[PDB]
Structure formats: structure tokens, C-alpha cells
Write a protein that binds this DNA or RNA. Structure first.
Lengths: 176, 166
DNA sequence: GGATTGCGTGAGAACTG
DNA sequence: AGTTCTCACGCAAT
């Protein structure tokens, strides 16, 4: 009964599936001790236990998402250089001014509308896409400065969205 | 008794983890240590050193997929749990092939070694076979267009990309 | 009554039909 | 019946 039921799949097969459990944590422990700068400078032995006891320090020093908006913002801005812009339904006046608008300060986005920051050739490709719950279109925004084609696209069982007054388009922009 | 002095530390880091309380403690012992390492590196996403002498989450729904050089993930979109049938913490740190097709694993491997400093090809774009949650067919061919970076044993090549459907 | 990483197996949840 | 796992106290090693 212990031929292949306890020796080949009871110990061997298990030993292969329960030994790595102790090598991955030590790996992570060694993989986590390095990140902690206050644990590597120890007399030839970062203690594999204090690697976590003091690790709570940085775990303490540093709810929605473990990353911060400025991170994701800089993250997406680093992803494909995407800035967030929120204009009105038809008014054309931009509501939000994105802090990663490095495709050009708020001089043109504060008063002038989006139509002012694009090329007039968008006479139709910039109004039809305005008011499919989500719009996909590649308008011609300018700010040499006229060739930064920006491809924009924006908008379980949930009806509305408890948030500020946002009946308009909120999309991104990436050099495509 | 020292073999129990750890859980007193784990319940801390588990509670010291940026995730909702609804399913916070659903993390296994290796899940916390896995997520415990996938967050501190975020601390140094950009700058946690100094040697050299909000509500902005509207873009995630209007769509961010991070990748490393050792064939594992660094950060999964905070909205990659609705367009895809899984959660962020479940694979926020595990290898990418665990969610990529078989014959297609060689494609992602070549986008880093044979590719690589803002020059050809700093920003790549291609299709591939991705996994699916089931009301699904088990794979989706997203369009991964990444922008290579130098995220900070010297630094290695990172990947700041955003994948979308086909 | 005393402590270090690390090696087994089994009580039992929890994903298996 | 079924299964993989996570989690548990116990053991020979420093």
C-alpha cells in the first residue's frame, strides 16, 4: 500500500511540492531583506528573522490601491505618455488640467477649449465623437509643433457612479 | 514558542498592506511575503533615494501593465480585474507566462533581450496570446505597446506598457 | 524551563466532479 | 466517495 502511494507520491512527490515552500520564503526573505536598507548592514549575517521583524518598519513607515495617484499618473505618463483631460459635452471648455501634460502649461488649457489646442482640420473628427458609451478617435492636437497625433479614447452591473458632476468625455492621449 | 512569534509579524504586514478589509486576510502566508516584496519596490518606483548632489484614477477605467526583466510582474492595473476575470494580488508578482499562452512565451522573452536610450525600439507594439478567466474562451489577443524604461547589481531594463483588447 | 534553519506527515480547509 | 493546497505541531540539524 506504501509502494507508490506513500514513497513515490507520499514523500518523493510531496518533498518536491513542500520543499520549495521553504525555499521561496527564504528567497522572498532574502528577496525582502535587500529592499530593507536598515537590514543589509549587519556583521556578515542579515538575520533571516529580523529581516521581517524590522521589515515592519518600512511596512509601517511607508486602502484603495497600494500605489498612489501620482505614481499611476507618473506610471501611465511613463507607460505611453498619457495625460488626462476632461472637457464638457459640447461647450468645449476643459474641466480638468492634467499635471503630466508634457506631450505647454495651462495658458492654453485654462481659458481656451480643446478645439483651440487641436488643429482646425478636426472640424468634424473633433465634434462628432462628442455628444457607444466610450469614444475612440484620433484628433489632431498641436500643443514643428503640428505633428503630435494623439489617439484618444474615453467615456459589473452598476447603473450610475456616485461622483462629481461628470456628464462629458474623460479620455487619455498617447503618441500613436 | 518562537515558531509562533512570526504570525504576530505576519498579521501586521498583512494589516499593513494597502488592500480593502473585505478580502484583506484572504492572503496566504506566501501571498503576503509575495505582496510584501511587490510593494516596497513601488516605494522606489521612481525615487526613494537621494545620493545625487488624489482622484486621478479615471484613466484606468478609460483604458497599465508593468513587467520586469526576470520574467515576472511588478504591478498590475488597478482596473485589470474587471476587463480580465482575475484579481491584481493573485498574479501581481508571479511570472507572466503563468498567464500567457504556450508557444507565445518565446515572443515576450524576445522583446527584452533582442530589443535592448529613447530610440528603436523604445516604444514597441504587438499582439500575443493572453489568458482569460467562465463566459470566455480562455485567451485574449491584447495589443501590448510598451515603453521601455530604466526602473530603479546595476539597473536592468523595465517595461511600462498598457495592454488593450483586439 | 532554557534558543537557530530546516526536515518530514497529517488534520482540514478548499478547490475538486 | 473525490482532490489539491494551506496550516499545524514535531523532529534532527547549527
Amino acid at each position: 500500500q506504501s509502494s507508490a502511494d506513500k514513497e513515490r507520491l507520499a514523500r518523493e512527490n510531496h518533498s518536491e511540492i513542500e520543499r520549495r515552500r521553504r525555499n521561496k520564503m527564504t528567497a522572498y526573505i532574502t528577496e525582502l531583506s535587500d529592499m530593507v536598507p536598515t537590514c543589509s548592514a549587519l556583521a556578515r549575517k542579515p538575520d533571516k528573522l529580523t529581516i521581517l521583524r524590522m521589515a515592519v518598519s518600512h511596512m509601517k513607515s511607508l486602502k484603495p490601491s497600494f500605489l498612489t495617484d501620482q505614481e499611476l499618473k507618473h506610471l501611465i505618463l511613463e507607460a505611453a505618455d498619457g495625460f488626462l483631460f476632461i472637457v464638457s459635452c459640447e461647450t468645449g471648455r476643459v474641466v480638468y488640467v492634467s499635471d503630466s501634460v508634457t506631450p505647454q502649461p495651462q495658458s492654453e488649457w485654462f481659458g481656451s477649449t480643446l478645439y483651440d489646442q487641436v488643429h482646425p482640420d478636426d472640424v468634424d473628427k473633433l465634434r462628432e465623437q462628442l455628444s457607444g458609451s466610450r469614444r475612440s478617435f484620433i484628433c489632431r492636437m498641436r500643443c514643428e509643433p503640428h505633428f503630435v497625433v494623439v489617439h484618444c479614447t474615453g467615456y459589473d452591473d452598476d447603473p450610475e457612479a456616485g461622483q462629481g458632476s461628470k456628464f462629458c468625455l474623460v479620455a487619455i492621449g498617447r503618441l500613436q | 514558542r518562537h515558531r509562533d512569534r512570526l504570525n504576530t509579524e505576519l498579521d501586521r504586514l498583512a494589516s499593513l498592506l494597502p488592500f480593502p478589509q473585505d478580502v484583506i486576510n484572504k492572503l496566504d502566508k506566501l501571498s503576503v511575503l509575495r505582496l510584501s516584496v511587490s510593494y516596497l519596490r513601488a516605494k522606489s518606483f521612481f525615487d526613494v533615494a537621494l545620493k545625487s548632489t488624489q482622484e486621478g484614477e479615471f484613466l484606468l477605467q478609460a483604458l497599465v501593465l508593468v513587467v520586469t526583466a526576470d520574467a515576472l510582474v511588478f504591478y498590475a492595473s488597478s482596473t485589470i480585474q474587471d476587463y480580465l476575470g482575475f484579481q491584481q494580488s493573485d498574479v501581481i508578482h508571479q511570472s507572466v507566462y503563468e498567464l500567457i499562452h504556450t508557444e507565445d512565451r518565446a515572443e515576450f522573452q524576445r522583446q527584452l533581450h533582442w530589443a535592448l536610450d529613447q530610440l528603436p525600439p523604445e516604444n514597441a507594439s504587438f499582439m500575443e496570446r493572453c489568458f482569460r478567466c467562465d463566459n470566455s474562451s480562455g485567451f485574449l489577443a491584447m495589443n501590448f505597446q510598451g515603453r521601455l524604461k530604466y526602473l530603479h547589481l546595476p539597473p536592468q531594463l523595465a517595461l511600462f506598457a498598457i495592454a488593450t483588447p483586439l
